[PDB]
Amino acid sequence: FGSLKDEDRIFTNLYGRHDWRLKGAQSRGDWYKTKEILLKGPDWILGEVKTSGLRGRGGAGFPTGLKWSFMNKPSDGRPKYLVVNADEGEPGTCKDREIIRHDPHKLVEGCLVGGRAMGARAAYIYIRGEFYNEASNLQVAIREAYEAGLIGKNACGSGYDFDVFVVRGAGAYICGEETALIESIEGKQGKPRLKPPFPADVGVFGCPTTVANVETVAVSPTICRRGGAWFASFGRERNSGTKLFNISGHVNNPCTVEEEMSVPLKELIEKHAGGVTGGWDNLLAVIPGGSSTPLIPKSVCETVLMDFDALIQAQTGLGTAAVIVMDRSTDIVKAIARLIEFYKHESCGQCTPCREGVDWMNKVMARFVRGDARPAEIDSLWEISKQIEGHTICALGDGAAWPVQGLIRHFRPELEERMQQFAQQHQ
Amino acid sequence: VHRDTPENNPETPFDFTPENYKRIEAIVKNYPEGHKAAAVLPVLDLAQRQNGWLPISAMNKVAEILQVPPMRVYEVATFYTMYNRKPVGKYHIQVCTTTPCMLRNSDSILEAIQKKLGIKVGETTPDKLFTLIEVECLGACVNAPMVQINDNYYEDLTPKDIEEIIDELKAGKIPKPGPRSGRFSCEPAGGLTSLTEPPKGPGFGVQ
Amino acid sequence: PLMGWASTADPLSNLVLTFSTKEDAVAFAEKNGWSYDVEERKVPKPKSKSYGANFSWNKRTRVSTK
């Protein structure tokens, strides 16, 4: 890991929050060396991200330097497109609508630069309809630079220069998974395909595309720019770079947080700036990620850093980078039960494992929060969570076992005392 | 609730404005022709923008625009959440309840809205326009239990905002589309400054 | 004509035998010596199906509503 840091400085990959959020002249960071970057060929950028080996901030590994170079057929006769996500579907993420808040010029910096690696034709970005004021300024941020003759259709200095076509969903599902977005980009109902047909860079819209995240392509200008010998900065030799965080739950200041790989959460969450709940001698029961990570008590996770294998050394790792706690006042069972209640109101409905397996649980998880009659249903409720893994298509089958499967772990007198109270009350 | 039509208005009618037909030209120009074939996500939502809630006669209209079968449109409008088929109000309010918003003291930004307003919970107002729903997953749980409106959002909620936003909109004011208190810029507060400078020598791209 | 029971003569009327093959099918109608008529076994097209061909660029097989 090195020196247990993961500091915070001003030499970052973000421009700045409070400096200027509107249109501008791209003062120092943006459009610094514009045409000289894409003057070279694709192999100058293909494998260039291996200096970081950026894993990808969508919610999994499979490094974004590898998916652009490898698993990328050259050409047969048909065009190619780019699909950049912007939907934030994990609850309490806030990693988006902060990049679009103050730094919108950076996203078109590497849109044309990232598409040169694939050689795609057009760029389709996808914003949630609910974020309407920020997405209104995004199309204004097009006309500030793109209309000014800097980009498209041959600008600048290259035969490769293209557009960015903004769409919106309404209330959709396609955040948490690809292959439902390239279906909902068409007009169909967004009930997703199988994920390996012929996976997403074989069968797409009409012709093969790519799926990336916001800071999977927002860091791509400066990672191709600063590069190094800096791209391995913090953490071990597994993960490398600096990733965006957020602090939510119980804090004096729940605020946006920026750091690098493998910081211990005991000194990271208490910093920036107040840890207003019980820092110790209360519970401070923590969740590693957004929704694909179950509970941890006050045990070794506070000594464990934020490496990918550090949480995989524990029961569950996470890539959503969202921190939520509940020390004293909150009921433990009550909070996560409304996160299983969440999945009933987003899930697709195709596969009989996910549909009519979540509702098997949501009917009975609301019984455990009440406190009711005889236990040993817990192991049955544990088995059903053990029975949705490879059965569903998308990750929301796998993202619905995990808040159950870890609540059943780690916590013996959760409802053994609660159901005792109602068994005593009925007595 | 149900999702069926017991023949309220088969022919409402609902035709578009000649200002709106030329905006349909721009959308079809984006998509590649042939597999264009469905621009139904902005086209049907543009019909929501003119009306406010779209009846069944609006669904039959866009099929004749895009030469699709009609059942291809009845389907899609009943999946996504934002579209509205029942009648709605002038101000459609959303109280974003989730797990961290439950932890962020939604409890007072819960009821005591109805003690402030006087309606049933989760229900439209009996008169005209206040219609109350609750939604999930929009951005910041790093803020308070924020309240979105049809054009913006209200960060940093509190019962004083319940005493304000409900109150000021009954007279028709604009109750602060943003964080009403706290940090105006959503900063680390103890890490906010970080020595604002040019970003430490741009030009490592020699390589 | 007292109830409606479909009464009958024709004392065979309920006999199915199960033979293993055509080669030993006709070898029983001759040994007891009655006439016959032989059908044929029908097995379907092999055939060509491929999920992932339901999404096209210029072809005609492209499904929706799923």
Partner: peptide
């Protein structure tokens, strides 16, 4: 911060330059 006024976004300057489109065919 305005519920309407999408023609400023949609067809104001993005109608002059699309660009181009060529976009292929796909008749089908």
């Amino acid at each position: 911060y305005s519920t309407y006024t999408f023609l400023d976004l949609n067809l104001d300057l993005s109608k002059f330059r699309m660009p181009q489109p060529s976009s292929g065919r796909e008749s089908p």
